[model samples]
Target: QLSDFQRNKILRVFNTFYDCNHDGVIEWDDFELAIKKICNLHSWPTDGKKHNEARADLKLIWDGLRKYADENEDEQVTKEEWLKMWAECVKSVEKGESLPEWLTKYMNFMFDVNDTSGDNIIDKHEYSTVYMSYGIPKSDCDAAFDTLSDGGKTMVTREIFARLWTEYFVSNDRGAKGNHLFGDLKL
Candidate 1:
């Protein structure tokens, strides 16, 4: 579980993106811009070739956010909306309840292995190294590399990092099954 401090820190980061003009209120454009930054930060491939692609990607995100936020129209997302969306995303990954079972197990395993500090959190460096070491398909790796490069650095937010960790580890669901095959294990 995240402490109140951790939660607030995350909210602040999201808020920084949401409050684009440094004003207190989040307008529609600011919300869109924030979502765009999120997609870029996570290295999601926008569909448009160059100039228009970002807008297209923003549209896609807006659609999803509308559903996620339960918004009826194109309006500013309030602090409550932001917190709700972020919390839902985090809970989905942490509980492994919203994703496929295999993905949940994989995330759990990777988190256990990579979180050497036992702080129940993985930082950017640790996440990047572990992600790179995985035997991902070449095309996917290429795409991920492109996204990571566009940002000029490999820092992933805690939420994005957690989601990626879950997706990478749990997507395969094919390795290290059945401990009984190894030995008659006993503690």
Candidate 2:
């Protein structure tokens, strides 16, 4: 559902999610750093049980990505590996194939991560995290969020988020507001 250019731009956004140290690669330590940020953003309970549960869920996400990207069995994702997996992911949707299970799970994980207040909907701050994490400045992300959202600063449900994600990838229109999802990364 996405052109090569679109795929590349979005791939960069995906990297920003966990290339935590920004050393041009992804490792477990970077993933741990990412989890800490979102868990804190969600204000997840610090009780042992709750902490363990969150860790488990985030660990699954990291494991899945690593398994997919560590094609050489080196246990690390170079920028090349990251782009290959994500580019193939774009091809999956474009070919009308089901997404890889890991991608599906990752989407769910991100929705939960962004629902920082746990009201089951994304508010301004929650949505901002989605855009800001990908390098969109807050001011622009706010405007994009307002447009992609249901309007009037209302909470955005998962359906809206999913649909907007689709629009971002599938629409080639330079003016598509969904293109602004990550800011200045034109489709």
Candidate 3:
């Protein structure tokens, strides 16, 4: 079971990023919108390899989410379905199971998307760009990045991001720095 704060964080994640179309469900169109926004921000050509790969990965990601969360196979995941799925997922992770494969892929995809320069390090510009592309305000992204990077004294490498990624999903601690991984967390 998720603590109230933990549940709120997950809800924020769903509402802020996953619910791109904002029709109150997770669907393929949401993923498609995300791909479009992120790819456009990085200027990945429409027919280029990067764009195509992003499209494919997002589709796979959607497929995985649907497989796990779409209880009725209706091609949509309601808030109830999304939260219920995370509840079980959080339990399994607490019990020593790894994140589901789709989640791992999603995390990696995010890292890849944010590391726009392909240098494997995410500076403030890269971080802000990606989050801003997702409709998060620049000021929020800047503040979140400062918090996430320890006042900009630390570099955000893949290793650091991976740790934060896991913490964001698994930690119920309201004070956890990972809480800001998505921006100045509304909840």
Candidate 4:
């Protein structure tokens, strides 16, 4: 169970995370703000195409929460409820339990970002894009890429990519084959 203050603290951070309209609820505006912030943080391309890419890539998270975490079904999980929702988000995935509604979108984002060459195989320098949005290190991203790569071929078909990506999010064991350092998070 979450302490009341801990819940407040988390939502406060989430509010700071991106509530653009000060509307007292997380919404698409906040989601867009985060996409832009991530681009700025990483010096990623923020031109129109990239902006659209970010939008396409990021909206799933908000949509997932709106679909699943809005506890009352009134569509406003805020303050304490918002924080608890995020706690559930982390737990459900980490425990190899239920997954968020956006699994397909999230996987597609990973594959799409890395598949810039438009081939099923993410080849050559394309691997660098694998973890770009997550601020994951060059070394770790390639390390995960190598694990996904067959015989160090330096390319992974999205078929290979998707399974590893799914394992990265869902597997509880550190020894899991696709133990991607998915984000900066470490326990």
Candidate 5:
């Protein structure tokens, strides 16, 4: 029951974030590539604890995606499957339900990525760095972070990020501030 705009935004997430390999599907290899990219961005060595935790966390995400979206047990989630899952998810959110566990896990993972310094707050620099590593342009990231952080006046805390995460995925409003949480929506 997603609006057209909402569907487009979700598709953007799938194409840019979930399908990290750009192979037109979500799978374990895409998650593995994401782990490598995130570790590389932070200079976390493969043998380090940081890398191991990221690996395990992303593995959980991949498993959750497969469980929720892989309707045929094919190990890969195609676009149809991804959209179908989100449709159900959108309905749940609209009914005033909380996000499912797998989606909440993703929200936590992204918040950790944005709070690179482990200070439990996301500053503009950390936000830009993380999204840039994910292929968002630096200028777009800066602009988005400016809005997200209230023009550099407010601190972005875990609670704030949780609100933003829910809004980003649940709100169909095209002009919602959380729409740019990931970066500019090119459409």
Candidate 6:
């Protein structure tokens, strides 16, 4: 479990984005802006040709949020609602369940092709090569590289590994299971 200090830190970071206009509650527009900011932060090709081709992707995300809001029809998503959605996203990823069909296939393919050592976990070298081969942008790849420990000599531990998975692989509303990583998922 996260100490109060850790949880407050996370809440502060997310609140800065989620509570747009400095209001206490997160509304639909706030949610959209948060997603957009996250995409830009990750260099996810939010502009130009990619933007034109994938405009609907942003809308899809908003639509999902709207559906969630409509189900409750409340002006704001409670802190618990927000956190639960995050947890669900993580669980989905860990289980390899309910991803967009193409993404699911791609992840499965990567898992099969990159685990050359026959170990379920892909170590640093394997992760780097395979991620690059998959056409991940150098900026994003560099960020991933920078997260490695000791010149990429060691396999990422659960804590470090979870950061990458949460930032890049998991969705805002769906995240890895809490206990699966560190047995408490506090951080």
CA lDDT of every candidate: 0.45, 0.68, 0.88, 0.59, 0.86, 0.46
TM-score of model 4 (CA atoms): 0.56
lDDT of 2 by residue, 72-156 (tens): 9887888778777767776777778765666557667677767766777877776777657656688876677767663665446
Across 63-140, the per-residue lDDT of candidate 4 in tens digits comes to 776787677777555765666665666566656665565756666665665666686877646666645544457776
Stronger candidate by TM-score (5 vs 6): 5
**Residue 115 in candidate 3 has what lDDT?**
89
Query: What digit string (tens of lDDT, one per residue) describes model 1 on residues 109-187?
Result: 4354445455665553444444444323444444443343233364433344455444332232223221111111121
> Which candidate leads the pack in TM-score?
5
Tens-digit per-residue lDDT, 15-95, candidate 3: 988998988999998888887877668777878998889888888888999999999999999999999999999999889
The best candidate by lDDT is 3
Number of colliding residue pairs in model 6: 9
Ranking by TM-score: 5, 3, 2, 4, 1, 6
Task: Name the regions of candidate 5 deviating beyond 4 angstroms.
Answer: none
Pairs of colliding residues, candidate 5: none
Task: Give one digit per residue, the lDDT tens place, for model 5 in 48-158.
Answer: 988888888888888888899899997999999999998998898888888878888888888898787888999888888888887899999988888788897878998
All candidates: TM-score: 0.41, 0.79, 0.94, 0.56, 0.95, 0.38
**lDDT score of residue 91 within candidate 2:** 72
Question: Which pairs of residues clash in candidate 6, taking residues 3 or more apart in a chain or in different chains?
Answer: 85-173, 88-175, 89-174, 89-175, 90-174, 90-175, 90-176, 91-175, 91-176
Model 6 segments beyond 4 Å from truth? 1-13, 31-55, 68-71, 87-145, 148-163, 167-187
Cα displacement (Å) at residue 89, model 1? 3.1
Candidate 6 structure quality by residue, lDDT tens digits, 25-94: 6666674564454345334566655344334453454455545533476756666665555455446666
As a TM-score, model 3 comes out at 0.94
Give per-residue lDDT, candidate 6, residue 149.
40
Model 3 is weakest, by summed lDDT over 10 consecutive residues, at 35-44
